[PDB]
Amino acid sequence: SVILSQFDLLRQAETKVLLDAIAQLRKIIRYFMSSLLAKAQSKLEEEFKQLLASYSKAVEPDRLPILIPSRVLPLLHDLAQQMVQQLLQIYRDTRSFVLEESLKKLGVEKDVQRMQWEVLEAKIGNWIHFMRIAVKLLFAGERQVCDQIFSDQCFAEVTVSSVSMLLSFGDAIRSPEKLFVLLDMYEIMRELHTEIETIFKGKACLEIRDSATGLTKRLAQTAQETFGDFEEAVEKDATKTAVLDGTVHPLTSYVINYVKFLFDYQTTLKQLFDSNSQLASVTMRIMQALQNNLDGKSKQYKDPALTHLFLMNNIHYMVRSVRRSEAKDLLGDDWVQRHRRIVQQHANQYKRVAWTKILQSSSAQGLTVSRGLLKERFKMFNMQFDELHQRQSQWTVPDTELRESLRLAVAEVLLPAYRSFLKRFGPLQKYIKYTAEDLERLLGELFE
């Protein structure tokens, strides 16, 4: 009879249609070839829609974050396999929304980055942690999508918005001080690149990978531009004085501190692209900029003794600070030696301009026994030393060893001439102010 079985099988199909039943209907259609189907398939696609939308919830900041139960995954896979862009359409619409909404729960890169630094730094670190978390949940999204399918296009379609947010925060970050956190961002983009390449796969997705790498390149290039900005900024610097003084300039401390921070990012900056060559070049050029500005603002003093004392202090501070770190780097030893020599030179020129006149006054060149002119020279000398001592007691060379060294220097160039001066005249009283030990006792007091 055959036909009765077929009609009864159609009846059973109708009895169920309200998976194998579809196959049965197909067999019946094939047998007859030798309306219920459409309904079953449409309700199947709407069933996939229903199941997908009923388990799409927002991941909460708190809790392998398990987005969907382990039970419904094979179900969704089966249903999807039964289907034939529509699946991608629904998945995109619902789940991408749910994903961006998921990122808005932790932070979200929701031109107007023009804010205060004090909150910008903390919000960038925030963005770092947000980057790590977001990638390490996008991993879960990817695993689920590639589990329910046996796919890249779907993942891409779902993630484009969220990753666009994340990446949108990073642009554009041009001014110094922002360089360190800029290279923090560089570090976090470098750290997760591999995981991004593993997660987003391709090829209909690669544009997110290259968007990420692209923003990384722009970030790094912007960092280099901040290098240029800082050296240029230290170069053309200005203002001002404080207690006048010949002591170390806060700018010098600021620059050596800046390079002291650039050396904390040595492993990162090595990835400059070479290696420590260019790092050394940047260090040497910001150093050169510092000293160039220093001599630029050293000619804004008087007497020249103060200028050379100041330059002595700052370049010595520079040399020492460099001798505390690297130094070992491609800055060299000839750099440290040359600059040490320059320091010694500033010291020498200070001693010359400061004490030449009083030293020639401490000699016999101008006499004429006499006693009268001898007394006149005694008074003259006393005035000279008093003025020099009261102008240079209020000065300050910070390095104790250096100041004691140069103290011993000026003492060693003054004491002999004065002692020889006393070993010829006198009492020839009390016109003989200061003895040897006395004159020595207020020499170890200047620069305090």
In short:
With 448 residues, the protein is an all-alpha fold.
Distance between the termini: 122 Å
What's the total helix number?
Answer: 18
Q: What is the general shape?
A: rod-shaped
Q: Please bin the fraction of helical residues.
A: over 70%
CATH architecture: Up-down Bundle
* Main sheet attributes: strand count, strand direction, barrel closure: none
CATH H-level superfamily = Exocyst complex component Exo70
* Count of distinct strands: 0
Beta-sheet strand percentage? under 5%
CATH topology: Monooxygenase
CATH class: Mainly Alpha
Summarize the helix and strand pattern as letters. HHHHHHHHHHHHHHHHHH
Explain what the structure shows.
The chain is mainly α and 448 residues long. It has one domain: Exocyst complex component Exo70 (Monooxygenase), CATH 1.20.1280. 71% of the residues lie in helices and 0% in strands. It has 18 helices and no strands. It is found in: Cytoplasm, Cytosol; Cytoplasm, Cytoskeleton, Phragmoplast; Cell membrane; Secreted, Cell wall. One of its GO terms (cellular component) is cytoskeleton. This is Exocyst complex component EXO70A1.
